[PDB]
C-alpha cells in the first residue's frame, strides 16, 4: 500500500509537471511537445504498476490525503478512488493519449501555437483523470466541467473561423443542460443523505433513487451525447483531428458512461432507471448509425460511429451489465482513436480534404494507413478475437438473454448491422476504386511519428481486448448457455451488413441516374434535428430577450 499509493499519485503528479514547468523552469520551447509526450509515456509506465498489483490480489485503496473544507457535518477532502475502474482505465487512456500526442507531433507540425496545443491536450487529459479517480461528487464535478471547458478551447482551436466558434459554444450549451442533472444528483444526495462521498452513498443505498438517478442519466445524456443532446458531438469535428481522436475515445464522451458505471450499486436495484437508459441508449445507437450511412465527410462518419457505440454502451448500462459497459469503453478507445488517426493521415496527404467523394484509390498509395484502417474497421464491427469482439460480442449475448424491452433489443441489433454498412462505406470510397483527388500527388505516410503512433494502437486493437479480458476478475456470472441463433446473432447481422453494403456501394457505379428519397434526405440531414432545433430554439430565446 506504500508502493501502491505512492505510484498511484506520482502518475497524476507527473502529468502536471509539464504544466508547472511552463513557468519558465529550464523551459525548452524548442521541443515542448516532445517533453509532453515523454511525460505521458512515463506516466503510462508508472500507472501500470498499481494495475499489476490490482490484477494480482485485487488490491484497492482510497486516498483522502488533503482536508479541504468542512461545512458543518459535510467534510470535503481531496480523495482518490483507486479501484477496478481507475486501475484499468488509466493505463488505457495514457496509452491512447501517448499515441495521439506522438501523432500530433507530426499532424500539428506547422501550427505556430504547437506548444499551446500540447498544453491543452495535457490539461484535457488531467481533467479526465480527476474525473475517473474522483471519490466524492464535488471532486468529480471539477473534472466533469474541466473536460467541458477544454473541449470548448480545443474545438474552437481555429478561432478565426465562425463555424469553429459556433461548434465550441454548441458543445458547452448541450453539456450544461446535462449538468442540470449533475447538480440535481448532488442536491439530492446532500439532502436525502448527508454526503457527496461515494462510500457513504453506497453504504446507505437508498431505494427511492429515481430522482438522483434521473439526474445522473441526464448528466450522462449530454456528456456522452445520447439522443436529445446529441448534435454537438458531430459538430465537434471543427476541431483539429488530434482533438477529435482524444475527444472520441480516452476523454470527454465516455465520461457520461463512466458516471453511470460508478453508480451501478444504485442502478442495480432500480428497474425503472434501467428501462430508461436501455431505451435511451437503443434509439441513440440506431439513430446515429442511420445518420452515418449517408455522410460524406470522413470525420463526420467516425463522429457518428462514436455516438452509435456510446449508445450501445448506454444499452449495456440499461441491461444491468455495468462491467461490460466498462470493458467496451476500454476496448473502444483503441480502435476508435486509431480510425481518427487514419483519417487524419488521409486528410493530411490530400491537402485538408475530408470528403470521401474526393478520395479513392488509396489502398496501395497508403499501405500502412490502409492496414490500420482495415484492422480498425474490423475491430469496430466485432470481427472475432480482435479488440472489439471481447466486449461487443458479450454485450449482444447478454442483451439477447436478458428480461429486456423487445423494441430496444431489435433496435440494438439493427444498429449492429448498420455498423458494418458505414464501416464498409469508408473503406469502399476512401481506399477502393480509382483516385478522385487532385492531380498533384503529395501522398506520403513515411514519417516515424505517424508510423510509430499508429503502430502502437494497431497492436492494441489486436491484443488489448484479449489481454484485458483475461486479467480482469469476474464480477458477474456470464451467461453462457443459450440457443445457437442467439449466440451467433451479432456475427450474423454483422455479416449481412457487409453483404448488404457491397450491393449498395456497387450500384453507385452503374450509369443510372439516382433519385433522391425521403429516407436518404432524412439520413443525410441528420433527421433534421439540427436544422429545426438549432434554428428554432435560438430564435425563440434570442427574440424573447430583446422584448
Amino acid at each position: 500500500m506504500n508502493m501502491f499509493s505512492s505510484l498511484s499519485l506520482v502518475t497524476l503528479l507527473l502529468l502536471t509537471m509539464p504544466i508547472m514547468m511552463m513557468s519558465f523552469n529550464t523551459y525548452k520551447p524548442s521541443n515542448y511537445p516532445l517533453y509532453v509526450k515523454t511525460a505521458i509515456s512515463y506516466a503510462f509506465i508508472t500507472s501500470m504498476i498499481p494495475t499489476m498489483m490490482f490484477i494480482h490480489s485485487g488490491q484497492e485503496l482510497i486516498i483522502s490525503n488533503w482536508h479541504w473544507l468542512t461545512i458543518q457535518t459535510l467534510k470535503l477532502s481531496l480523495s482518490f478512488k483507486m479501484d477496478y475502474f481507475s486501475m484499468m482505465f488509466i493505463p488505457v487512456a495514457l496509452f491512447v493519449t501517448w499515441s495521439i500526442m506522438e501523432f500530433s507531433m507530426w499532424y500539428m507540425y506547422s501550427d505556430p501555437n504547437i506548444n499551446k496545443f500540447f498544453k491543452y491536450l495535457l490539461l484535457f487529459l488531467i481533467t479526465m483523470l480527476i474525473l475517473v479517480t474522483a471519490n466524492n461528487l464535488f471532486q468529480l464535478f471539477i473534472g466533469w466541467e474541466g473536460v467541458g471547458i477544454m473541449s470548448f478551447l480545443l474545438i474552437g482551436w481555429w478561432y478565426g473561423r465562425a463555424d469553429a466558434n459556433t461548434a465550441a459554444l454548441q458543445a458547452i450549451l448541450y453539456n450544461r443542460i446535462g449538468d442540470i442533472g449533475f447538480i440535481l444528483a448532488m442536491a439530492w444526495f446532500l439532502t436525502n443523505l448527508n454526503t457527496w462521498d461515494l462510500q457513504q452513498i453506497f453504504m446507505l443505498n437508498p431505494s427511492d433513487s429515481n430522482m438522483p438517478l434521473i439526474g445522473l442519466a441526464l448528466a450522462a445524456t449530454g456528456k456522452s451525447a445520447q439522443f436529445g443532446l446529441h448534435p454537438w458531438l458531430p459538430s465537434a469535428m471543427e476541431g483539429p483531428t488530434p482533438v477529435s481522436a482524444l475527444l472520441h475515445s480516452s476523454t470527454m464522451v465516455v465520461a457520461g458512461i463512466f458516471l453511470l458505471i460508478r453508480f451501478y450499486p444504485l442502478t442495480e436495484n432500480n428497474k425503472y432507471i434501467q428501462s430508461i437508459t436501455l431505451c435511451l441508449g437503443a434509439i441513440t445507437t440506431l439513430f446515429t448509425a442511420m445518420c452515418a450511412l449517408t455522410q460524406n465527410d470522413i470525420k463526420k462518419i467516425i463522429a457518428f460511429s462514436t455516438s452509435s457505440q456510446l449508445g450501445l454502451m448506454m444499452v449495456t448500462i440499461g441491461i444491468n451489465q455495468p462491467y461490460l459497459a466498462f470493458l467496451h469503453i476500454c476496448t473502444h478507445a483503441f480502435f476508435k482513436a486509431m480510425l481518427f488517426m487514419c483519417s487524419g493521415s488521409i486528410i493530411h496527404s490530400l491537402n485538408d480534404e475530408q470528403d470521401i467523394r474526393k478520395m479513392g484509390g488509396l489502398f496501395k498509395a497508403m499501405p500502412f494507413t490502409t492496414t490500420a484502417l482495415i484492422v480498425g474497421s474490423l475491430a469496430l464491427t466485432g470481427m472475432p478475437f480482435l479488440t472489439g469482439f471481447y466486449s461487443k460480442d458479450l454485450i449482444i449475448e447478454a442483451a439477447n438473454t436478458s428480461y429486456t424491452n423487445a423494441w430496444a433489443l431489435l433496435m440494438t441489433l439493427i444498429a449492429t448491422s448498420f455498423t458494418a454498412i458505414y464501416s464498409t462505406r469508408i473503406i469502399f470510397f476512401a481506399l477502393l476504386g480509382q483516385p478522385r483527388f487532385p492531380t498533384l500527388v503529395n501522398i506520403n505516410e513515411n514519417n516515424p511519428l505517424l508510423i510509430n503512433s499508429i503502430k502502437r494502437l494497431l497492436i492494441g486493437s489486436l491484443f488489448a481486448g484479449y489481454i484485458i479480458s483475461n486479467n480482469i476478475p469476474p464480477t458477474t456470472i456470464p451467461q453462457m448457455t443459450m440457443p445457437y441463433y442467439l449466440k451467433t446473432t451479432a456475427l450474423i447481422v454483422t455479416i449481412l451488413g457487409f453483404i448488404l453494403a457491397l450491393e449498395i456501394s456497387n450500384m453507385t457505379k452503374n450509369l443510372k441516374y439516382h433519385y433522391p428519397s425521403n429516407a436518404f434526405k432524412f439520413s443525410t440531414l441528420l433527421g433534421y434535428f439540427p436544422t429545426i432545433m438549432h434554428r428554432l430554439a435560438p430564435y425563440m430565446n434570442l427574440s424573447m430577450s430583446q422584448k
Binding site: M1, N2, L9, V10, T38, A39, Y42, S57, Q59, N65
Partner: protein, 104 residues
C-alpha cells in the same frame, strides 16, 4: 464577357506591386540577428526519470508515510481476500478447506 481594358491595366499594375511586396517578405541570410548515441538517449531518459519520477516519488512517499497515513482513515485499504486453505500472516491462522465437492 471579359476584362475591360482598364480592368486589365489596373490588375497588371497591382500585380507588379503585390509581387514585389511578397518578395520583400523574404528573410535576409543573417536575419534573424539574434543577441548573444545510445548513451545520449539514455542520459536524456535517465535524467528524465530522476527529475520526473524519482524526486516526485521521494516527495510523495515522504508525504504519505509521515503526514497522511499518520492521520486516521486517510488511506483506507480494501481488506485482502481470504480464500479457504490460506494462512494468515498476522496470526499464523490456517483457514480450513471447503467441503468435498460432489463429482462433476
Amino acid at each position: 464577357s471579359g476584362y475591360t481594358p482598364e480592368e486589365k491595366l489596373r490588375l497588371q499594375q497591382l500585380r507588379e506591386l503585390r509581387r514585389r511586396w511578397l518578395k520583400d517578405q523574404e528573410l535576409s541570410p543573417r536575419e534573424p540577428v539574434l543577441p548573444p548515441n545510445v548513451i545520449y538517449k539514455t542520459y536524456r531518459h535517465s535524467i528524465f526519470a530522476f527529475t520526473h519520477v524519482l524526486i516526485p516519488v521521494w516527495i510523495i512517499h515522504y508525504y504519505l508515510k509521515y503526514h497522511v497515513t499518520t492521520k486516521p482513515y486517510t488511506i483506507v485499504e480494501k481488506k485482502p481476500r481470504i480464500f479457504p486453505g490460506d494462512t494468515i500472516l498476522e496470526t499464523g491462522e490456517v483457514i480450513p478447506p471447503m467441503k468435498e465437492f460432489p463429482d462433476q
